[PDB]
Structure formats: structure tokens, C-alpha cells
Coordinates of N, CA, C and O in Angstrom, one line a residue:
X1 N -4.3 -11.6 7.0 CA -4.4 -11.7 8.5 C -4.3 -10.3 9.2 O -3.5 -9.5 8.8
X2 N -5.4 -10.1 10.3 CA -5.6 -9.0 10.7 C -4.7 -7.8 10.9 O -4.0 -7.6 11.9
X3 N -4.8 -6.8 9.6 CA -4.5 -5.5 9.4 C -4.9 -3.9 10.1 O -6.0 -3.8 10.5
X4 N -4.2 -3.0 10.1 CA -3.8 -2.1 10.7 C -2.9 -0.9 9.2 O -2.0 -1.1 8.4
X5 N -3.9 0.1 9.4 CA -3.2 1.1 8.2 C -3.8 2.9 9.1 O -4.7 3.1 9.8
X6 N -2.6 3.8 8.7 CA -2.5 5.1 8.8 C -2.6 6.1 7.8 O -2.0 6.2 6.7
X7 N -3.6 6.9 8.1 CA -4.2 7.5 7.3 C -3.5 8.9 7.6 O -3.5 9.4 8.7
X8 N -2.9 9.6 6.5 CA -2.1 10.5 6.9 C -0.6 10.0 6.7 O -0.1 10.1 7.8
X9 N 0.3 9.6 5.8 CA 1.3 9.3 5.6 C 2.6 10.0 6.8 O 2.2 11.1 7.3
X10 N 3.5 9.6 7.1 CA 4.4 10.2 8.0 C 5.0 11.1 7.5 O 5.5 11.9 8.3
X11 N 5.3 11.4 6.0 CA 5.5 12.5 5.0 C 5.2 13.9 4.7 O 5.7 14.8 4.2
X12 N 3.4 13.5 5.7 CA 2.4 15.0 5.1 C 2.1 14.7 4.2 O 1.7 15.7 3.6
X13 N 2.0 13.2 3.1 CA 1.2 13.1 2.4 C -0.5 12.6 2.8 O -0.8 11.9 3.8
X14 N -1.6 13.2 1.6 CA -2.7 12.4 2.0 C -2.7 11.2 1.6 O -3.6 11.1 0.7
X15 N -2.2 10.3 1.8 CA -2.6 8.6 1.5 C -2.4 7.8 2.5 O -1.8 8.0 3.5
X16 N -3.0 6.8 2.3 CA -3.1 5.7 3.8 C -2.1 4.5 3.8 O -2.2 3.8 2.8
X17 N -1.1 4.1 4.8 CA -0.2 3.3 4.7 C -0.5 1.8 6.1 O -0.6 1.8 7.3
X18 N -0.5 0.8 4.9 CA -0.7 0.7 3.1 C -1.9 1.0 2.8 O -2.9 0.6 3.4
X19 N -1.9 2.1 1.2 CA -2.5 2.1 0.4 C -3.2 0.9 -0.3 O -4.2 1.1 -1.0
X20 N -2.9 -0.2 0.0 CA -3.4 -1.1 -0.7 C -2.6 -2.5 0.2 O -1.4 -2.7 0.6
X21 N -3.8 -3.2 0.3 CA -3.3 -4.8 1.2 C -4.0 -6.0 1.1 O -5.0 -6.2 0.4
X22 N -3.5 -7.1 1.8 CA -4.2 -8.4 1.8 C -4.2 -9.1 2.7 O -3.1 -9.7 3.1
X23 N -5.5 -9.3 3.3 CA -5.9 -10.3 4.3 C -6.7 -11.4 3.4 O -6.8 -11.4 2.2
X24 N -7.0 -12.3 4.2 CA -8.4 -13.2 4.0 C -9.3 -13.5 4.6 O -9.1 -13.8 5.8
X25 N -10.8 -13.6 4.0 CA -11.7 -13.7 3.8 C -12.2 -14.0 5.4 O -12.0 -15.1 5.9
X26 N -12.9 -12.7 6.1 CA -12.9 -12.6 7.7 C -12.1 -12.2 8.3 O -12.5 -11.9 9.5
X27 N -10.9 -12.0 8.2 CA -9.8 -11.1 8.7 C -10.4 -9.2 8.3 O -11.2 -8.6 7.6
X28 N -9.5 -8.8 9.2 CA -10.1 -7.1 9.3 C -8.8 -6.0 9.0 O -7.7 -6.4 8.7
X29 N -9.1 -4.8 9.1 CA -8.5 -3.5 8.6 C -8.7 -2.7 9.8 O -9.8 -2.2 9.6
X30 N -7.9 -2.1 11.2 CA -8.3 -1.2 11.8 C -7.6 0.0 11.8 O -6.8 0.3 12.7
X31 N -7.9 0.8 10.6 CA -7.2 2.3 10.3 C -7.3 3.1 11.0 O -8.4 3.1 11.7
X32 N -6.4 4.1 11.3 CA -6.1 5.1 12.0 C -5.9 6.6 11.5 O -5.5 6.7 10.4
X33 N -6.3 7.8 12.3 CA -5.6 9.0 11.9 C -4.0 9.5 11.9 O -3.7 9.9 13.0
X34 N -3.4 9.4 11.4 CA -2.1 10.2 11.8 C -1.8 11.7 11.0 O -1.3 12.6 11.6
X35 N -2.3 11.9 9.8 CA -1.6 13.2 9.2 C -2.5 13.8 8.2 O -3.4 13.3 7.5
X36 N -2.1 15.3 8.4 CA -2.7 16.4 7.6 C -4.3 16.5 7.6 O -4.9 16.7 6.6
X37 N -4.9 16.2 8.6 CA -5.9 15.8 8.8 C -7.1 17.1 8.5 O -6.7 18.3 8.6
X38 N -8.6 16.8 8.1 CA -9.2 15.3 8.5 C -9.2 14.8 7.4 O -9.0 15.4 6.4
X39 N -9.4 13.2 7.7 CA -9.3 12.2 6.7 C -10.6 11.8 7.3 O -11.2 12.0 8.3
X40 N -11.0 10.6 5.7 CA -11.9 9.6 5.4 C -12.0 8.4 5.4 O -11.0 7.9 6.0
X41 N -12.9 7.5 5.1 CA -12.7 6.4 5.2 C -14.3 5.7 4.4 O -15.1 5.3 5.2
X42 N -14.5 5.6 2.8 CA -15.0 5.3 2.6 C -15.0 4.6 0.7 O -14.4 4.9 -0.4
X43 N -16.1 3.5 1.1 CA -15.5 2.2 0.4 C -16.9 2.3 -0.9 O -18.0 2.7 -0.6
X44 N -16.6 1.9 -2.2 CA -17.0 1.3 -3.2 C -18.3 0.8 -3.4 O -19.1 1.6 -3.9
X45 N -18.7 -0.7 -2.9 CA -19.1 -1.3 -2.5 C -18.8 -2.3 -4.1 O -19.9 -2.5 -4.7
X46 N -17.5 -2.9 -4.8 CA -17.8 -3.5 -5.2 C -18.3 -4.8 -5.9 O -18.3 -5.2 -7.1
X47 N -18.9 -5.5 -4.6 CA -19.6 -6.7 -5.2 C -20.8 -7.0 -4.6 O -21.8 -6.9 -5.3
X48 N -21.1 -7.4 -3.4 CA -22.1 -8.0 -2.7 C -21.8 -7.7 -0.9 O -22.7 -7.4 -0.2
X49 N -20.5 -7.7 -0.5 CA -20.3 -7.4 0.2 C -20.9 -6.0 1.2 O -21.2 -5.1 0.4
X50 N -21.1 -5.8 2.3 CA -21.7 -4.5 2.7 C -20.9 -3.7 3.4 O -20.9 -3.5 4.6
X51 N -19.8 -3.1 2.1 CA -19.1 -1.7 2.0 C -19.3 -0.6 3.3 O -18.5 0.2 3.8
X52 N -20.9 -1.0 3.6 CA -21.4 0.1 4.2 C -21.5 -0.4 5.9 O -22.0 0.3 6.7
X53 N -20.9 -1.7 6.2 CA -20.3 -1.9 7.5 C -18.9 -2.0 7.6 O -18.4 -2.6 8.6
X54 N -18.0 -1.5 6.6 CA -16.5 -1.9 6.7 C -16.0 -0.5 6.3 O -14.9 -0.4 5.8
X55 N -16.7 0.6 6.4 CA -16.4 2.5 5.4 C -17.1 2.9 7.0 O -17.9 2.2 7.7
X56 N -16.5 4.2 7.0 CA -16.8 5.4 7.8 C -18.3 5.7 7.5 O -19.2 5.6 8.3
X57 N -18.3 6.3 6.2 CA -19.5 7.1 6.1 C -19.2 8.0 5.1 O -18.0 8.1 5.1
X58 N -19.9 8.8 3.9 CA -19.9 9.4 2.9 C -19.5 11.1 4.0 O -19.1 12.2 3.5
X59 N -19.7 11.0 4.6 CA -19.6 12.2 6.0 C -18.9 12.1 7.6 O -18.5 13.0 8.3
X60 N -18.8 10.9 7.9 CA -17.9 9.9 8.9 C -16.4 11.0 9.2 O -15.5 10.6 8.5
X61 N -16.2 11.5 9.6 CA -14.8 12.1 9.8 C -13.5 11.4 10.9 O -13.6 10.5 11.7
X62 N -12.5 12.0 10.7 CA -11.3 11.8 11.8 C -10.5 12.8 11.4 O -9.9 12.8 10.3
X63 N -10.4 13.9 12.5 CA -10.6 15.1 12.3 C -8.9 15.2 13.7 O -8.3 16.3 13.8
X64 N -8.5 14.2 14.5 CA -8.2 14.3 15.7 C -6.9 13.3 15.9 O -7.1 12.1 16.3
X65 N -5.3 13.7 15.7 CA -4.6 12.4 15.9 C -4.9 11.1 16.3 O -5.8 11.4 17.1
X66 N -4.9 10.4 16.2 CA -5.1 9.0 16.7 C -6.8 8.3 16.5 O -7.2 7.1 16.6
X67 N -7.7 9.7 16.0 CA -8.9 9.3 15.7 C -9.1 8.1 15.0 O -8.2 8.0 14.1
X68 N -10.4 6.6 14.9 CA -10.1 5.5 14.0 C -11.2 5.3 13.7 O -12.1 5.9 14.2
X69 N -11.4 4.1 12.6 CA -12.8 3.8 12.6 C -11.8 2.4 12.2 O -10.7 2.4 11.9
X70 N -12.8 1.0 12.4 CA -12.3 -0.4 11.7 C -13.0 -1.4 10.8 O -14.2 -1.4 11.0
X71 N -12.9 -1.7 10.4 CA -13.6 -2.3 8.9 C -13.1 -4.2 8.9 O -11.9 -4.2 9.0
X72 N -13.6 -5.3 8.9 CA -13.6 -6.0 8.5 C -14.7 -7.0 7.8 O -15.8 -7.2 8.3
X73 N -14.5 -7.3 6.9 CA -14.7 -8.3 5.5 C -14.3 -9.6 4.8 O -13.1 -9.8 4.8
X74 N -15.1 -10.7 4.2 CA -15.3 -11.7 4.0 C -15.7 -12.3 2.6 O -15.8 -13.5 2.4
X75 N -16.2 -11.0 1.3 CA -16.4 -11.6 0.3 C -14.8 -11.7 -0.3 O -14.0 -10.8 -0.1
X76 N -14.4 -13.2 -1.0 CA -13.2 -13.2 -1.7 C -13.5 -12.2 -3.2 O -14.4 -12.1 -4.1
X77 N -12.5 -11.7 -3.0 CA -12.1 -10.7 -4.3 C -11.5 -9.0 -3.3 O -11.5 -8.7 -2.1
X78 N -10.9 -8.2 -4.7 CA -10.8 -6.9 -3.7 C -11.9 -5.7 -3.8 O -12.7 -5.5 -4.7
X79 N -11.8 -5.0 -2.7 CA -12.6 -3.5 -2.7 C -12.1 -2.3 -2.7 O -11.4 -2.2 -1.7
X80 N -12.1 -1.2 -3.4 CA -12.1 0.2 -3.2 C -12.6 0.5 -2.1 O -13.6 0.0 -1.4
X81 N -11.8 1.6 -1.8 CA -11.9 2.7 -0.9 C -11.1 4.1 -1.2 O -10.1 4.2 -2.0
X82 N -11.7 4.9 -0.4 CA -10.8 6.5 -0.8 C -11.8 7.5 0.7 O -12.9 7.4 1.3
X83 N -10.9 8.3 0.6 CA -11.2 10.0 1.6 C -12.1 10.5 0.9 O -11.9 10.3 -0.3
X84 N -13.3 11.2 1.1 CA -13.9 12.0 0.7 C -13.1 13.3 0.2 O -12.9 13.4 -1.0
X85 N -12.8 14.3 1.1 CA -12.5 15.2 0.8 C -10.6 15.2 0.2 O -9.9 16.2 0.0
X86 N -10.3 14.3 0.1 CA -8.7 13.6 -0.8 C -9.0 12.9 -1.8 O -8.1 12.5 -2.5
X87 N -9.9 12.8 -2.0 CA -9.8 11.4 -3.5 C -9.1 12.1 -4.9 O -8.2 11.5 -5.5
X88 N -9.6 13.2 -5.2 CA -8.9 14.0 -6.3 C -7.3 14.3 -6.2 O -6.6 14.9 -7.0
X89 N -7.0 13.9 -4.7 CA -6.0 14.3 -4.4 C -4.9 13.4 -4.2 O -3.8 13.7 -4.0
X90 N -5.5 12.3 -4.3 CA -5.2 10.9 -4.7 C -5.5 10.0 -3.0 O -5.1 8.8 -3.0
X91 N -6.0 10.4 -2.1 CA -6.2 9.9 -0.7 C -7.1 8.3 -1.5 O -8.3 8.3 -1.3
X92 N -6.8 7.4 -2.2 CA -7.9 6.6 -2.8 C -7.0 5.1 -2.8 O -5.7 5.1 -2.7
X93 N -7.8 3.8 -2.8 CA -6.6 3.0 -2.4 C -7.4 1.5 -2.8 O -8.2 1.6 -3.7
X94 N -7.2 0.4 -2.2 CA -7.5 -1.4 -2.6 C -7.4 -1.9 -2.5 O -6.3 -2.4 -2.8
X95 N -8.3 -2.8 -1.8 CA -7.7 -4.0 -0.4 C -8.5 -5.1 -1.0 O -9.4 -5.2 -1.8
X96 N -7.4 -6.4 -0.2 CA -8.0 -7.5 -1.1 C -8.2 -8.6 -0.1 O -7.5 -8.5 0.9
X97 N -9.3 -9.8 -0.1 CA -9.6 -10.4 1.2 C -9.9 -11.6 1.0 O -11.1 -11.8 1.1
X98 N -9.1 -12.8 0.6 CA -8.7 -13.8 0.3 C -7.5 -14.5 0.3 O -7.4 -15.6 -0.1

């Protein structure tokens, strides 16, 4: 049920809190900027679902405190996501929507 995550850990780490969550199937994710920025916001596309209306953009930024993008989804099962320029860095994460 309708989620909310921070991108930018309150640490100064790059990871998004929570890193990994669970709604169901039509419920949503509205993430935020908070730290060491800029951060990303883009998704997999695991299954059938369209990754590509619930992700930023392969280029999409939030570059700006409080900057957001929001994402919600309805195939049951989970999806990947990760930061572009963090993934090696571990900014990478797994939401699940059932």
C-alpha cells in the first residue's frame, strides 16, 4: 500500500530508503531526492509490465533536494531498479507488487 522512498540515504550513503519494498498490485512508489546528489531512478523492465512508465529515464535526473519522480505498478511479481550513475556503487535496489 502506497509507498514513498529517499534517494540519498540520511548517512551520505548512495542508496534509496527502502532499498527494497512491498505494495500490491496498483498501489505506487513516490521517491524522492534527499542525498549526495544527483540521483536516478531507473527500472529493469522485468516482465511485461511497462518499467518505462514507473523509471525516470536512462538520462531522467534529480539533481536538486527534494527533486521526485513517482512510479506506480500492477504486474504481481517483483522489479529491479537502480541510479544510473550509482549502480556500480551499489545505488541498485527491488520492489515487489502483490
Amino acid at each position: 500500500a502506497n509507498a514513498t522512498v529517499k534517494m540519498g540515504s540520511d548517512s551520505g550513503a548512495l542508496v534509496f530508503e527502502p532499498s527494497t519494498v512491498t505494495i500490491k498490485a496498483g498501489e505506487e512508489v513516490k521517491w524522492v531526492n534527499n542525498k549526495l546528489s544527483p540521483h536516478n531512478i531507473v527500472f529493469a523492465a522485468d516482465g511485461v509490465d511497462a518499467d518505462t512508465a514507473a523509471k525516470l529515464s536512462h538520462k531522467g535526473l534529480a539533481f536538486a533536494a527534494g527533486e521526485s519522480f513517482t512510479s506506480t505498478f500492477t504486474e504481481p511479481g517483483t522489479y529491479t531498479y537502480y541510479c544510473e550513475p550509482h549502480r556500480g556503487a551499489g545505488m541498485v535496489g527491488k520492489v515487489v507488487v502483490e
